Symmetry: D2
Subunit: 180 residues, 4 copies
């Protein structure tokens, strides 16, 4: 039990390593261009994945990329799917166990020709098989509770890539939050 802090932190370092290993410059560049070209971004993440979706929407919105975050399925998610536009981007955060509403949101968007992106735990997972853009992270926990550190690091990379691409837009939003 006295080893539990070193085990936990060592494990999160391996999560970052497996994630860095599986990070592809081409996949990152294409995911970043899709985020920037969208007129509106929808991020869906439920259960364990909700915190990653909340982090990604905060980060996008903070950079001037208008984003809706949905952390529950049901009727609200169904009506969003019913109102999708070809200029939207649907990002699903979905890892094992794959909660069906997120996978269904990617499948519904894909069917309607709407660009899709999956932040997932395997390059052949159900959301990976559907989505146009796939980013993979390790999620291993020392016990049953998973760790979102690898998913959060992919979000950190995405935000850093956008901020370098469009610094004026990001600085402008920053000027308004600095005022509050």
């Amino acid at each position: 039990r006295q080893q539990l802090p070193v085990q936990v932190f060592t494990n999160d370092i391996e999560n970052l390593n497996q994630t860095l290993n599986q990070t592809q410059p081409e996949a990152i560049e294409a995911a970043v261009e899709a985020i920037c070209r969208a007129d509106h971004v929808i991020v869906v993440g439920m259960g364990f994945s909700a915190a990653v979706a909340v982090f990604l929407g905060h980060g996008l919105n903070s950079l001037g990329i208008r984003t809706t975050v949905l952390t529950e399925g049901g009727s609200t998610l169904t009506i969003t799917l019913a109102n999708l536009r070809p200029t939207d981007l649907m990002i699903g955060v979905s890892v094992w166990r794959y909660l069906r509403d997120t996978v269904a949101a990617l499948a519904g968007a894909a069917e309607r020709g709407v660009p899709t992106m999956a932040l997932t735990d395997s390059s052949v997972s159900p959301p990976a098989r559907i989505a146009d853009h796939v980013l993979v992270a390790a999620t291993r926990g020392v016990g049953h509770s998973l760790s979102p550190v690898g998913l959060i690091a992919v979000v950190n990379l995405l935000l850093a890539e956008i901020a370098v691409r469009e610094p004026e837009r990001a600085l402008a939003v920053l000027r308004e939050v600095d005022r509050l």
Copy 2:
């Protein structure tokens, strides 16, 4: 004594409906409906007591095919929302006594940026009414310190009824899509 409370509560809400109907202006409803329909995106803000009304109005607009964001809290999320406003947005604030600052700040930030605004409020001369381009007023009187939202809710019922008659094909496409999403993806 308190055996009279059901008659008092239900009669108070009937009187709120009568007073709200008496204050409704056809020109103002028509201008409010045209503003909602012309927007590329609608943001609805309501906090505390008003949050329920903002939730109902956003549910209604999204069901009719008008893409709508509902905010029931202020702060950094609202600041960032204001920072990202576009001239083709419509900001709807639901704000009644006591006027929680952040809903009024949401209307003010939109009006300062040249974004159309609308207030669903309790007086034609309240702080949000004085800021917004479009104003709709409802009676909110409760039998006690808990106000009643029935008046505000009836005004939203009227806006939803007016939009559904103007754009019934857009409303049906949503219903048809929701049915399709249940059939094909189990949603």
Copy 3:
């Protein structure tokens, strides 16, 4: 041109019909259940979300600690797994009855947790499960229902709790001002 009169007349009729269906015994038993609970969970989705939001706000503002859930799935399953016999589950559920609210009521009833339904029929799926049922009229002029009758029922519960426990209601105002 006649839509404002039709919409407002329809909502007056929803209130009158809801008043006609209100049973003093049922209101009394429901207020006693809300006041007895250590914690209250209110579940309402889709059209019913606004009603759950209003009821949660009103109960919290009277000093009744309440959680509002307006979506199902994960948060709801975990909520059911953590339910205590001292909780009260209130489901706001009307036609078309979204499954997750009905499932929240069933899950609470199976676990021996007091339940209450705010619904549109004495024999609706949530009414058949719940210990306490309160029925409201929901007819809208269109295809889109009106929550006015359900909202009046909540106004009536709040009004009844406020008279029973006025010092707890005042204390919440006093804390809010102090804060």
Copy 4:
């Protein structure tokens, strides 16, 4: 230039894990876990950048059988929560620079009323650290203006792992129940 961003970003987060591990004190984690288990109810507050950390912590706690409310915005909802506090609650505030006042006021409000408080923060001398009974610090440095919650998330990972080992029976029952309800629905 931009080709180095994956290495910069991922190295930055490894350094955050290393720096957070070094600042983690066993007596403070132990007292934090005992206070979370002793509470009859846990309230987690985290706004803006900190909202994701609050959401993760509330999920993890709830998933282990610790009944937790999560608030990611201030205003009237937070103010009414503060008005209804019990001595048996635990107030957890996730608050880092720029310290949004509503989270710091939630901690100040709870502490004034003698309600146990805990801060998940970025400095042992930050405004929320100076108010709270329990303080856990993590490194939050990002490669740019967007900070990184990786260090804070790893502190949460440690709290959840410590709770799971203390109360394994409760955690498994919630996991079974949760799996059984997901199977059902």
